[PDB]
Every structure is written in C-alpha cells, then in structure tokens.
C-alpha cells in the first residue's frame, strides 16, 4: 500500500494531544478513520514542530497535516485544503479583574504572546500594521497554547486570542478560573481543515469523499462528542 505521512506538532487539546507516548485527538482520530480499512492507503502520524510541519508540506515530505488549521488565502496558495471538520468560534481572554479590555478594539498598548505563522499572529500584525500610533504589543514565542494560557493566568501579558474549544479546554483541565471569555466575530466561517501538499490532488479527493462518509455514518459527530463533549460540526452544505 502507500504510506501516507501526516505530521502536526501536538497541540492543541481536544484536537491533538498525546497519551501513552502517542498521538490522539478528534482530527488525529478522524484521520484514522479516514484511513481504517483503505485498500489503498496506509496511515502514518509524525510529531514534529510547528515550523516544520509546514516545511515538511513544502519539501513534499509529508503529505497531510492535522493542527487546528483554519484557512487563509496565503496558505491556499501553497497548500490544499480538505472538506473542513470542525467549526469552532474565535475568543479573545483576558483576566476578569481587568476591566480595561473589552473587545479587540482596546488591545493598543497591550501585551499578548503569539506564534510564528498563525492565524491570530496574522491577524495582530495587520491590526498593527493599521494602528500605527498605538500598537499592540507583540512577542513571539514557541511555547504551545496551554503554556501560553498558564502565563496570561500568571500576570506576564495582558491579553490573548484563540478559539472556543481550546480556551476552554485548558481553562477547565488547567483551573484557570482568573480568565474572562470574550466572543469574537468572525469574516469566515470559523472551520477547521486538514491540510495537504501541494500535488496530492489524488488523495485530497479520497479524502473529501471520507470525510462525507464519515459524516453521514454518524462518526465525526460520535468523535466531536468523545473529544469536545457537544457537536462542533460545519454545516453538510459546507463540507466539501
Ligand atoms: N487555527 C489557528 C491556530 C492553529 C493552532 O492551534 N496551532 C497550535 C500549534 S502552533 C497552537 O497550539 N497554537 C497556539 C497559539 O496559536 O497560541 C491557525 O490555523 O493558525
């Protein structure tokens, strides 16, 4: 069979996490459904870092990636995009003795922590890019969501951006009851997509046609329920 490689850094949790030295999570266990029983295909999953799953799509040494990945324009020109497999809504957290931010419009002068090449660190960068006169403050780090939502918990910084599931995730596991959840809009709809290189276009279209399967026999609802404890799905119409 072919052996198909699909990489993520393992984070965040419920999505990705690991357990007994190996990897699990609602798209980890979606994928192995994709997979089970192909007459076709053998799956494979590999940990690596953050950078690396994207330089590995791009030196065709992996062939899918699995990390919480939300769609972009400058990822679509570089990647594929699979039928999406979960939705979950954009927050912004912020400590609830501090009145002093309400929404994304008072992040000026403010302090968060990023990582290199998201969606959120994306988003912050334009919002500078416009506010030139007031920044937010920005400092890149490559520690992973749970450490980062420990340190905002802890007093080092004053705000951060995420997303509903892991957010509350890490605030119910980590006891982090000092922090205050804001909704925020959203542009798009807030779907969440396995992501493959460039060139597979073979195997995005057995993975497409899975996903449908797998949504229609019940079992993306079964695992959303296992992993997140309510149903996260996009709309049928979307999932394509
Ligand atoms: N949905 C966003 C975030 C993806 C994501 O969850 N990335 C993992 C691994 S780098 C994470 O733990 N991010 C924490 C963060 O962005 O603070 C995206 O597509 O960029």
Redo the contacts with the bound molecule.
Sequence with gaps: KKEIIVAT????RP??YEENGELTGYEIEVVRAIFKDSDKYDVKFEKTE?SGVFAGLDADRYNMAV??????KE?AEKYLYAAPIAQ?PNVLVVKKDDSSIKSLDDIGGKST???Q??????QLEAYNAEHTDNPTILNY?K????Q?MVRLSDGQFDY????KI?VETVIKNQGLDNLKVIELPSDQQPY?YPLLAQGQDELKSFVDKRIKELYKDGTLEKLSKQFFGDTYLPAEADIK
């Design positions: 850094n393992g984070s965040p999505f990705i953050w990390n919480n990945l939300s769609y972009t990822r979950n922590e990023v990582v090449a998201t969606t959120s660190a994306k780090t520690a992973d969501f749970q980062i951060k951006i995420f997303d892991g969440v």
